[PDB]
Design a protein around this ligand. Structure first.
Ligand SMILES: [Ca+2]
Ligand SMILES: [Ca+2]
Lengths: 167, 156
């Protein structure tokens, strides 16, 4: 029953309205960090900060979820996008892995990131996790890690979100 | 043939102590030939007697992202870079289990974090994880990787 997915707060949007895409995990054993690569159509959707609406540049950082926010484990965050190609690449992780393990309180289920999409056009479009050569061993553009610092190579599914503004 | 030379520098801040450790040991190869050289403590390489032609020059070192410079025209003695404007190399494509994946990504950061907060007086410190060779495995090493995060060789 383990997975990573994206959920939209809204699956329909007029031009100028912001859709919040939340990256969510379920039952990832001893989860310590993620990196995901996301493909969208930049003519249809503009990536923006979901809280403020400030448009993403290629360095804009993801909005935090409920996981990876314990400051005692030294969270770090990356955003390295190609907005002209409709590619976002987002990552967040803990650095003080030993301290995290000593808590015996693993984070395994919950939201991990939020990104905003403002509609530029009304037409049907998709946001999906997508393979990147920057993550050659990714599972459909996803890499998840445990608190020993290792990539989790099996045991979870990638569930793509539904279409936006379909029909 | 003629001489192809130049300078390679890791892309992070160094001191008089750490510079000679990290500038040495980059292999520079003229692809499709037997001609190569290794950088000295100043980052300098010199490849003797290269036949005229157009080549890819490949630069490698453990725990660095490999760089290939395409379309290098050799017709005479040729300096590819200077000490003032060296060829930069990006630390943090880590050899994990003896193998690098050809990308700088989160796996590289977490490989270092397995030893987060250690120093060279600790048994758990590994010099290869101490990218800047300052005797500590710290956030500074992680930030060296983060500088060129989510990149592959074609991004040079
Ligand atoms: Ca790597
Ligand atoms: Ca260091």
């Amino acid at each position: 029953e383990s997975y990573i997915t994206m959920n939209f707060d809204k699956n329909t949007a007029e031009v100028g309205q912001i859709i919040k895409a939340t990256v969510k995990i379920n039952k990832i054993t001893n989860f310590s960090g993620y990196q995901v690569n996301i493909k969208y159509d930049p003519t249809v959707l503009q990536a923006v900060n979901p809280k403020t609406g400030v448009a993403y540049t290629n360095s804009s950082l993801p909005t935090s979820g409920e996981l990876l926010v314990n400051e005692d484990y030294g969270p770090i965050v990356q955003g390295v996008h190609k907005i002209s190609e409709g590619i976002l690449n987002l990552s967040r992780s803990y650095t003080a892995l030993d301290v995290y393990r000593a808590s015996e309180s693993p984070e395994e289920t919950g939201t991990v990131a939020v990104v905003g999409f403002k509609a530029l056009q009304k037409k049907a479009t998709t946001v999906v996790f997508e393979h990147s050569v920057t993550m050659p061993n990714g599972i459909i553009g996803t890499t998840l890690f445990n608190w020993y610092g290792n990539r989790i190579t099996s045991g979870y599914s990638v569930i793509q979100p539904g279409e936006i503004n379909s029909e | 043939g003629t001489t192809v030379s130049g300078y390679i520098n890791p892309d992070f801040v160094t001191t008089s102590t750490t510079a000679p450790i990290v500038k040495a040991g980059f292999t520079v190869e003229i692809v499709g030939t037997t001609k190569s050289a290794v950088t000295d403590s100043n980052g300098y390489f010199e490849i003797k007697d290269v036949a005229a032609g157009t080549y890819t020059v490949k630069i490698t070192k453990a725990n660095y992202l490999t760089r290939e410079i395409a379309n290098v025209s050799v017709t005479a003695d040729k300096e590819l870079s200077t000490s003032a404007s060296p060829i930069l190399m990006w630390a943090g494509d880590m050899a994990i289990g003896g193998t690098q994946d050809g990308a700088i990504n989160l796996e590289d950061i977490l490989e270092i974090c397995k030893a987060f907060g250690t120093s060279s007086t600790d048994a758990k410190y590994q010099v290869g994880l101490d990218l800047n060779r300052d005797g500590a495995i710290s956030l500074e090493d992680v930030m060296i990787v983060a500088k060129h995060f989510n990149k592959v060789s074609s991004d040079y």
